[PDB]
Ligand code: HEM
């Protein structure tokens with residue numbers, strides 16, 4: 001009985017280890033594989049030095065039973081991430097208790113169904129009205145920030161940006177009305193923190209990899225408590241909207257619109273979806289999009305404002321660009337976001353050096369041959385290291401240098417299409433990319449018009465992976481009103 005399970009395990013690792021025989025790599029500890037380096041602070045930068053020692057790719061082991069091929073070169077990236085192979089179950093299985101089998105984790109033709117269902121929810125006609133909402137939520141955040149700034153001390157902006165991103169996500173895509181944040185929404189935010197802290201730690205800690213053992217550890221119990229808290233939040237948001245649509249005034253109003261917001265699509269009002277969702281399939285897409293359409297943009301906004309603080313020259317250039325575009329308008333219009341070409345460049349360079357998602361994974365369903373002759377069989381595990389990809393010395397002159405002009409029209413024409421993929425690429429790219437970009441542009445444009453941002457030399461951020469890219473100590477900045 002149990003004997004089979006242990007043998008199925010030991011065969012898999014000789015399979016994975018032999019398929020990577022073509023690929024030299026760093027030294028393994030006998031028990032931990034590479035885990036003792038990965039768990040060290042700064043390990044993203046350690047992986048970068050590895051990519052210079054080993055071109056294209058190198059193996060990566062958490063504790064001797066699971067072995068990934070870390071990849072970080074554009075042809076290698078493209079060979080795999082253009083194909084739609086499944087997400088790595090060893091990594092993505094951990095998601096299930098929390099966000100379930102929603103879009104992120106699915107892989108079948110069921111994935112294509114949901115992707116087809118949900119993609120019109122991020123069409124630009126659905127997005128145009130969100131610009132006003134981004135502005136309102138940002139205004140609330142900035143009024144808080146104005147009070148903190150005139151106290152003269154630096155403070156962590158990450159959490160305030162998150163509360164704002166969560167509120168705006170819910171007003172846009174989950175039907176929440178103008179009421180704004182409630183103490184129960186903050187409960188949810190805190191729980192996401194615990195979920196991503198713990199699940200990242202689980203990814204890196206091979207002893208927690210087996211389901212049965214993990215749910216008996218304090219770690220796993222803490223995770224399940226947070227999963228309940230996340231589910232109490234999403235059950236509420238679902239019941240709230242179903243009930244709001246029982247009102248005859250609101251229900252007729254939604255039908256009139258050609259374009260439906262994301263939660264209303266899932267609820268299949270108008271019968272148009274033609275695909276019937278289980279109660280749990282819908283709970284999972286809500287869980288999924290409630291993690292995804294806000295934790296990442298919080299990382300992005302916050303690392304950007306840090307990059308503005310580090311580089312006042314570019315900060316001031318962006319401040320001037322957005323000042324002219326707004327002119328005398330009350331608030332930015334959707335049409336205005338395309339004019340923000342220099343803000344966009346700086347934002348792209350921010351995402352090169354501080355990718356909001358630094359690492360994603362796949363398990364191949366078919367073999368793949370790489371531009372240099374090497375190859376892998378089906379069954380093998382891939383680790384796309386977006387962090388080291390964006391820092392690759394054969395692709396990026398002076399990789400550690402912040403230079404927005406790398407994303408001018410001129411210096412972009414030649415560039416390889418898989419060199420810069422912070423929203424991934426291929427069939428499993430980010431469904432929310434244009435949502436994020438428009439949100440982040442409105443938020444940061446308004447931030448720079450109302451404050452000048454300085455770093456704090458005594459508390460510079462330190463990089464911390466937590467599924468999204470966070471900081472060990474927050475993002476502490478000084479703010480000057482204007
Ligand atoms: C949900 C969701 C997906 C899955 C879409 C699908 O599978 O069809 C998605 C994908 C990605 C990926 C790939 C994930 C992987 O390889 O495991 C990356 C790297 C990424 C990065 C960012 N996303 Fe995203 N994303 C989903 C949802 C959202 C939403 C939802 C409203 C927004 C907004 C958004 C934004 C960003 C983002 C912004 C800074 C980054 C980076 N994503 N997504």
Ligand SMILES: CCCCc1ccc(N/C=N\O)c(C)c1
Pocket residue numbers: 091092104291292293295296357359360361430467468
């Ligand atoms: C398995 C480690 C990374 C998994 C992962 C994949 C996608 C997202 N987000 C995508 N858009 O928001 C996050 C936040 C994480």
